[PDB]
């Protein structure tokens, strides 16, 4: 009937069938599309009972609807109830992917050509979203889906904001300013950490709190310049350290990539490199093609986004944004 799977109901209508549970905002399943005759990925999200729930899903739904890219995931369809009252669940239907980078970096090893290519598709895709003055805020290997033909796409646009921070967060990829970060440069750091993780097959900065993540970076990045309150006094108390050479952690790595890696993983956000600049790096000459690589047609405009609204009004906003996909409307 409703094609209930695992433990709860998964009413996706006659359109999608043969539900397979993938795992994991909410439940994620792989259904078969009959309209396009190709397996797709449906994720069930059931918010509306929390303040920050309705925002991030609206933020993700909006952005993914107005974006089109070869390296950014795209919503194919959305399903929900005809009315406000009966609408309790939202079904985001997106095209199916074989795996993500987190599952890739474990159990599997990448060549320098495969590493360079992925970092490119990250950057090629990142420079589009960054061209629209929008921040991803939370970039992770788990948020980088991978196509069978080595094509990379980006997800998790819930925490996205235009160019509460502290709310529910793997804190291995946060920037030195997001220790406790509101620019493009905070994403580059994450992408920098990812490159370091693709290069070592292991997390560059382990531990997800102050005694480790911002402490282990001091072991590699070293003590900062005096350019750099309770986080301030804590660092000054800690003994001075030196920067361990990137060609010691990564001795069998490309000399080109290590240069870029250091340019991406600088301490201070200022002059911490930029998109397009990173694309122009010698490590990415075989793939860089500014004539083909798409950019944002126009920055993400305002007035329509100011989520200090109650959950009651946010649900209404979800309804409008979703009505564009509703079969009868």
């Amino acid at each position: 009937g409703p094609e209930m799977v695992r433990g709860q109901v998964f009413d996706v209508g006659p359109r999608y069938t043969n539900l397979s549970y993938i795992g994991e905002y909410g439940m994620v399943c792989s259904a078969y599309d009959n309209v396009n005759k190709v397996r797709v990925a449906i994720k069930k999200i059931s918010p509306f009972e929390h303040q920050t729930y309705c925002q991030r899903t609206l933020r993700e739904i909006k952005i993914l609807l107005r974006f089109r890219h070869e390296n950014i995931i795209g919503i194919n369809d959305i399903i929900r109830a005809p009315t406000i009252e009966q609408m309790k669940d939202v079904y985001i239907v997106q095209d199916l992917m074989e795996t993500d980078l987190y599952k890739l970096l474990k159990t599997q090893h990448l060549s320098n050509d495969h590493i360079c290519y992925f970092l490119y598709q990250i950057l090629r895709g990142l420079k589009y979203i960054h061209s629209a003055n929008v921040l991803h805020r939370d970039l992770k290997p788990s948020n980088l889906l991978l196509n069978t033909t080595c094509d990379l796409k980006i997800c998790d646009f819930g925490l996205a904001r235009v160019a509460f921070l502290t709310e529910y967060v793997t804190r291995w990829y946060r920037a030195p300013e997001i220790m406790l970060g509101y620019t493009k440069s905070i994403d580059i750091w994450s992408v920098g950490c990812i490159l370091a993780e693709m290069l070592s097959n292991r997390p560059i900065f382990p531990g997800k709190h102050y005694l480790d993540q911002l402490n282990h970076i001091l072991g590699i990045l070293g003590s900062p310049s005096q350019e750099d309150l309770k986080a301030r006094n804590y660092l000054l108390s800690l003994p001075h350290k030196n920067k361990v050479p990137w060609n010691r952690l990564f001795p069998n790595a490309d000399s080109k990539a290590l240069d870029l890696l250091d340019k991406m993983l600088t301490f201070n956000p200022h002059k911490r490199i930029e998109v397009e600049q990173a694309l122009a790096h010698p490590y990415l000459e075989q793939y860089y093609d500014p004539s083909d690589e798409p950019i944002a047609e126009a920055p993400f405009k305002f007035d329509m986004e100011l989520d200090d609204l109650p959950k009651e009004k946010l649900k209404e906003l979800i309804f409008e944004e979703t009505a564009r996909f509703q079969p009868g409307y």
Partner: peptide
């Protein structure tokens, strides 16, 4: 002639 290179990585 198949560009974009030929490798399928694989399973979740």
């Amino acid at each position: 002639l198949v560009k974009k290179y030929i490798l399928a990585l694989w399973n979740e």
